[PDB]
Amino acid sequence: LSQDFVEALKAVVGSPHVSTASAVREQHGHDESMHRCQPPDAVVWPQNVDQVSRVASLCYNQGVPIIPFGTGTGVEGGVCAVQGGVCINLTHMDQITELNTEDFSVVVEPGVTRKALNTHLRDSGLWFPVDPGADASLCGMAATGASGTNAVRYGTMRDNVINLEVVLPDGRLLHTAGRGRHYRKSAAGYNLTGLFVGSEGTLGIITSTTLRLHPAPEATVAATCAFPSVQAAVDSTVQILQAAVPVARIEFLDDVMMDACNRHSKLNCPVAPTLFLEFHGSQQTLAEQLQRTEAITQDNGGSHFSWAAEKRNELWAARHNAWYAALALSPGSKAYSTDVCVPISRLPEILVETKEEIKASKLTGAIVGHVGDGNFHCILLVDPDDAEEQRRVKAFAENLGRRALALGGTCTGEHGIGLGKRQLLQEEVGPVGVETMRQLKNTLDPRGLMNPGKVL
Ligand SMILES: Cc1cc2nc3c(=O)[nH]c(=O)nc-3n(C[C@H](O)[C@H](O)[C@H](O)COP(=O)(O)OP(=O)(O)OC[C@H]3O[C@@H](n4cnc5c(N)ncnc54)[C@H](O)[C@@H]3O)c2cc1C
Numbered sequence: 015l016s017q018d019f020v021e022a023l024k025a026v027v028g029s030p031h032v033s034t035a036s037a038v039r040e041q042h043g044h045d046e047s048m049h050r051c052q053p054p055d056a057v058v059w060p061q062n063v064d065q066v067s068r069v070a071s072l073c074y075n076q077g078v079p080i081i082p083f084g085t086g087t088g089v090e091g092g093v094c095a096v097q098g099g100v101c102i103n104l105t106h107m108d109q110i111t112e113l114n115t116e117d118f119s120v121v122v123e124p125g126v127t128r129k130a131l132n133t134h135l136r137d138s139g140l141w142f143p144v145d146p147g148a149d150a151s152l153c154g155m156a157a158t159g160a161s162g163t164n165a166v167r168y169g170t171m172r173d174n175v176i177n178l179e180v181v182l183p184d185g186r187l188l189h190t191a192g193r194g195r196h197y198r199k200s201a202a203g204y205n206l207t208g209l210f211v212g213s214e215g216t217l218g219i220i221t222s223t224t225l226r227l228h229p230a231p232e233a234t235v236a237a238t239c240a241f242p243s244v245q246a247a248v249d250s251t252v253q254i255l256q257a258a259v260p261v262a263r264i265e266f267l268d269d270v271m272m273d274a275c276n277r278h279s280k281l282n283c284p285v286a287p288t289l290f291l292e293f294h295g296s297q298q299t300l301a302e303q304l305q306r307t308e309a310i311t312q313d314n315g316g317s318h319f320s321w322a323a324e325k326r327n328e329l330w331a332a333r334h335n336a337w338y339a340a341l342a343l344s345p346g347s348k349a350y351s352t353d354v355c356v357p358i359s360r361l362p363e364i365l366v367e368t369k370e371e372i373k374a375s376k377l378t379g380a381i382v383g384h385v386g387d388g389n390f391h392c393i394l395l396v397d398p399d400d401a402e403e404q405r406r407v408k409a410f411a412e413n414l415g416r417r418a419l420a421l422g423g424t425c426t427g428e429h430g431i432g433l434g435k436r437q438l439l440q441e442e443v444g445p446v447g448v449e450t451m452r453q454l455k456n457t458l459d460p461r462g463l464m465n466p467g468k469v470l
């Protein structure tokens with residue numbers, strides 16, 4: 015990066031908001047995954063959308079890659095600057111606007127986390143449900159297509175993003191559904207909002223997101239249920255979904271993950287394949303849901319429900335920290351997560367096979383995830399210096415991904431592709447799907463400067 019170029023960047027955002035210092039670039043060259051740090055050539059913090067547009071235009075016309083950066087909690091290397099360039103940290107734009115309680119909508123800028131939003135919403139009777147474990151940027155969640163434990167009932171980011179404000183690679187400002195618009199459904203033109211959800215910073219920079227809010231549940235009950243085997247836990251899950259019980263949360267932990275979470279959060283659940291459940295409704299619709307759900311879990315050997323404000327909060331905090339609980343099994347290690355999502359009737363086969371495969375392998379793996387969506391994570395630990403173990407973990411993850419594709423599923427339910435799953439994506443959608451995705455990338459980013467090396 016030339017001195018003239020750096021000075022041009024400082025003219026847009028101000029000298030304190032541009033850094034070429036090695037330590038600052040290294041901090042923005044990696045996310046939470048094991049993907050190797052690849053530092054950008056500079057980090058820039060735009061202070062408003064006009065500055066985002068002008069930074070993008072400067073980079074784009076000079077042939078300098080752009081890497082959007084939210085909270086850096088991704089797990090597929092999305093922020094790694096594989097071709098160098100300018101990392102745009104968007105978190106100084108942190109305002110909540112256009113809170114429309116009567117329409118159940120709100121507009122947020124990239125520095126707003128879900129925690130910040132739900133704090134702002136206390137005493138409104140509304141909440142935003144999509145809950146990744148990490149305290150992530152909501153616009154980053156829109157960029158990755160995130161989901162979480164609440165998605166089985168309340169939907170993913172794709173279900174809950176109503177509109178996006180996007181700075182395109184050359185600096186133009188796009189409101190995907192129209193500036194200021196919010197509504198429940200539309201057939202007007204092509205749905206641009208869904209194209210940018212899950213685009214991972216390869217099609218443009220999300221500078222605000224319009225989110226669907228939901229009413230807080232009238233009443234909540236959480237519980238855990240221990241099972242004799244993975245098969246019994248996942249069969250119960252499939253049967254709960256087939257019985258159409260509107261469970262609010264249904265999270266699976268294998269015995270390895272349950273033990274890790276016990277040690278990391280000082281829970282002391284029985285070490286066993288376990289479901290964490292939550293039910294929303296009136297005092298009485300809960301009783302109906304509980305009866306029907308306990309009946310199914312009992313048929314599969316589930317324990318009597320161990321029931322759980324503070325107790326529930328510690329239960330789900332432990333679940334949200336499962337990633338760090340797994341890492342704590344081997345201090346100094348990094349982690350790589352699988353994220354397959356299969357048709358629900360095939361979930362028992364692939365989960366049980368994954369458990370058997372982790373057992374037969376020398377790898378440390380913990381299993382957790384959103385089995386209500388037919389989705390789960392195998393969290394695999396890697397010694398950052400053991401090159402052979404890394405090759406074993408990547409091979410394990412790619413074999414699992416190919417098994418999911420063989421079952422009609424997808425290689426990633428929520429984390430995205432980034433650097434890790436590019437070959438699986440090619441297999442998943444085939445030559446015409448890849449070419450079509452690439453033609454869309456090319457028309458929005460002709461010079462290929464919008465987060466190069468990711469997704470495609
Ligand atoms: C402990 C832990 C638990 C997690 N649990 C979940 C979970 O349950 N569900 C889930 O889906 N994910 C989960 N994640 C992954 C991660 O939190 C999500 O992928 C989240 O959406 C990433 O947001 P971010 O701003 O931190 O992303 P970053 O790492 O900053 O960026 C991720 C990607 O999005 C792009 N990007 C970021 N912000 C923007 C923007 N404003 N405009 C355009 N592109 C942008 C980046 O260029 C990159 O390619 C977890 C992560 C951790 C560490």
Ligand SMILES: [Mn+2]
Binds near residue numbers: 384391
């Ligand atoms: Mn998850």
